Write a protein that binds this ligand. Structure first.
Ligand SMILES: COc1cc2c(cc1OC)[C@H]1CC(=O)[C@H](CC(C)C)CN1CC2
Length: 386
């Protein structure tokens, strides 16, 4: 059980490190405080809209053949994408590699959380373990951009991707020796169909709380001033620094609240997280400086980690309670909810910021987050099966 948790942690860590190592490199491929960028928006939306599409199939797939094979396929796709990045001399193949990374993320984020849920059947154990696993995502996002900047400038253009490929090969060897995916291992019972789970209001509440928490940051990041050419020409260090606050805060929030959400109550933890997300992004329109975004980014990361640590275990809890205890489809739903913000926001936020304005966009997103929060009260005591 320890080694499965370590494998999931490492998979998410390297996934989100490959996700973000490209940040210092992106400006070289395309060359008010917040202005939306189409070409950055496409880089954000490609992986997310391929992972969202892939997610339901992985939920259905893990029922047929079990979890280890999709996890190993996620590793394979991650390695192939990492190799393709190191030799992508064009923007369109950057998009292609992002789509491949989306497929791999779908695999290793649906089947890894499903295996965590199935291996840790205790509710409190599952909460703690999933908090650690999401801390892995936070660590990957933390490490990515600075590693990319250091190796890109002081070693060479291809060095960060080759080193990351070596790390991914180590991850694959660990998965080979632990999971041994050579044999098809179907689930012990047929899971509840996806259409029936989507008709459950409480799973909808949890998925909505997961989804709306990510909307504001999903619409903020493609609009950051760091993509402007003055950063590439003079201010390069901001490309590495800009994602540190949210990563640190998300890491701390997930680590503490994986433990704390069970004692406090995951409904109350998610409600407070949603309120804090709504309030912290309402403070973004106040910023007239890039340094003004540091505190709202820290608050947003902390509260998003809080919401995730509250809501990821209850996805397994709700199927253990009201449905058949098979975890692939509920985490397909949860990952669809997570990816929907980064899939839609880079386009919808740009259109809305053109229509009414970006400060009003962030204001409305925060207001929506605040208004959604009372719905978490329904998760306090859901009824069981008949
Ligand atoms: C360069 O591309 C991307 C960069 C980034 C993200 C997504 C991207 O592409 C889809 C997300 C990842 C998270 O979940 C992050 C959530 C927590 C770290 C708060 C937010 N940001 C980090 C940077």
């Amino acid at each position: 059980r320890k080694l499965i948790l370590f494998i999931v942690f490492l998979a998410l860590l390297l996934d989100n490190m490959l996700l973000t190592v490209v940040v210092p490199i992106i400006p070289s491929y395309l060359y008010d405080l917040l202005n939306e960028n189409v070409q950055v928006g496409l880089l954000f939306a490609s992986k997310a809209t391929v992972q969202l599409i892939t997610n339901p199939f992985i939920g259905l797939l893990t029922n047929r053949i079990g979890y280890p094979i999709p996890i190993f396929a996620g590793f394979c796709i991650m390695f192939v994408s990492t190799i393709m990045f190191a030799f992508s001399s064009s923007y369109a193949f950057l998009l292609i590699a992002r789509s491949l990374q989306g497929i791999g993320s779908s695999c290793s984020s649906v089947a890894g959380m499903g295996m965590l849920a199935s291996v840790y059947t205790d509710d409190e154990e599952r909460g703690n373990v999933m908090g650690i696993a999401l801390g892995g995502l936070a660590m990957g996002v933390l490490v990515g951009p600075p590693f990319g900047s250091v190796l890109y400038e002081f070693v060479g253009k291809t060095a960060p991707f080759l080193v990351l490929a070596a790390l991914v090969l180590l991850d694959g060897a660990i998965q080979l020796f632990v999971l041994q995916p050579s044999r098809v291992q179907p689930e012990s019972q047929k899971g509840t169909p996806l259409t029936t789970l989507l008709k459950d209001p409480y799973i909808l509440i949890a998925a909505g709380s997961i989804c709306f928490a990510n909307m504001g940051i999903a619409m903020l990041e493609p609009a950051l001033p760091i993509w402007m050419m003055e950063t590439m020409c003079s201010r390069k260090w901001q490309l590495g620094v800009a994602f540190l606050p949210a990563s640190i805060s998300y890491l701390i929030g997930t680590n503490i609240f994986g433990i704390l959400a069970h004692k406090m109550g995951r409904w109350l933890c998610a409600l407070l997280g949603m309120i804090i997300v709504g309030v912290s992004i309402l403070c973004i329109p106040f910023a007239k400086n890039i340094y003004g975004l540091i505190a709202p980014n820290f608050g947003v990361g902390f509260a998003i980690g809080m919401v995730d640590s509250s809501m990821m275990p209850i996805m397994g809890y709700l199927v253990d309670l009201r449905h058949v205890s098979v975890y692939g489809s509920v985490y397909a739903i949860a990952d669809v909810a997570f990816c929907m913000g980064y899939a839609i926001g880079p386009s919808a936020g740009g259109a809305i910021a053109k229509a009414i304005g970006f400060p009003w966009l962030m204001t409305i997103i925060g207001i929506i987050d605040i208004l959604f929060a009372p719905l978490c009260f329904f998760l306090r005591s859901p009824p069981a099966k008949e």
